[PDB]
Amino acid sequence: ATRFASVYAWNRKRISNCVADYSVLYNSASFSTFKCYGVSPTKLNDLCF
Amino acid sequence: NNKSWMESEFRVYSSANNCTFEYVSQPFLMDLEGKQGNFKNLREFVFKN
Ligand SMILES: *[C@@H]1O[C@H](CO)[C@@H](O)[C@H](O)[C@H]1NC(C)=O
Ligand SMILES: *[C@@H]1O[C@H](CO)[C@@H](O)[C@H](O)[C@H]1NC(C)=O
Ligand SMILES: *[C@@H]1O[C@H](CO)[C@@H](O)[C@H](O)[C@H]1NC(C)=O
C-alpha cells in the first residue's frame, strides 16, 4: 500500500478466512527491523493460527 | 412501480460492538418472486459447535 496510519491511531486489520503467504515477509530484505517473539521468524510458513 | 422483488428492511440487531468475525460471500442473484404450488425446494442442515 501507499499510506499507513498514525502511531496513536494504529490501524487494526483482522486477518482470517484467507489463504496466507509469509514468504514475502523475509524474501524482500528491505525492512530494517524484523523480529518475531514466540514465533520462528523463518518458520512463519510452517505455523498455523 | 419497480416490477421486481428485493429485500428492503434488516431489523435483526440494533447495533454491534467489539465484534470478532465476519465473512461475506460473492454477489449473487436469487429469485425472490413468490411461487405458488407444491413445495419444490427442501434444504437440510446440521449445525454443531
Ligand atoms: C423504484 O426504484 C427507484 C430507484 O432506486 C426508487 O427511487 C423508487 O423509490 C422505487 N420505487 C418503489 C415503489 O420501490
Ligand atoms: C445487505 O442488505 C442490507 C439491507 O438491504 C443492506 O443495507 C446492506 O448494504 C447489504 N449488504 C451487502 C454486502 O450487500
Ligand atoms: C471484547 O470482548 C472480549 C470477550 O469478553 C474481551 O476479552 C475484550 O476485552 C473485549 N474488547 C473490548 C474492546 O471491549
Curated annotation (Swiss-Prot), chain A:
Domain of life: Viruses
Known outcome of mutating S30P: In strain: Omicron/BA.1, Omicron/BA.2, Omicron/BA.2.12.1, Omicron/BA.2.75, Omicron/BA.4, Omicron/BA.5, Omicron/BQ.1.1, Omicron/XBB.1.5, Omicron/EG.5.1
Residues of the full protein shown: 344 to 392 of 1273
Quaternary structure and interacting proteins, as annotated: Binds to host ACE2. RBD also interacts with the N-linked glycan on 'Asn-90' of ACE2. Cleavage of S generates a polybasic C-terminal sequence on S1 that binds to host Neuropilin-1 (NRP1) and Neuropilin-2 (NRP2) receptors. Interacts with host integrin alpha-5/beta-1 (ITGA5:ITGB1) and with ACE2 in complex with integrin alpha-5/beta-1 (ITGA5:ITGB1). May interact via cytoplasmic c-terminus with M protein. May interact (via N-terminus) with host bilirubin and biliverdin, thereby preventing antibody binding to the SARS-CoV-2 spike NTD via an allosteric mechanism.
Function per UniProt: Attaches the virion to the cell membrane by interacting with host receptor, initiating the infection. The major receptor is host ACE2. When S2/S2' has been cleaved, binding to the receptor triggers direct fusion at the cell membrane. When S2/S2' has not been cleaved, binding to the receptor results in internalization of the virus by endocytosis using host TFRC and GRM2 and leading to fusion of the virion membrane with the host endosomal membrane. Alternatively, may use NRP1/NRP2 and integrin as entry receptors.
Record's protein name: Spike protein S1
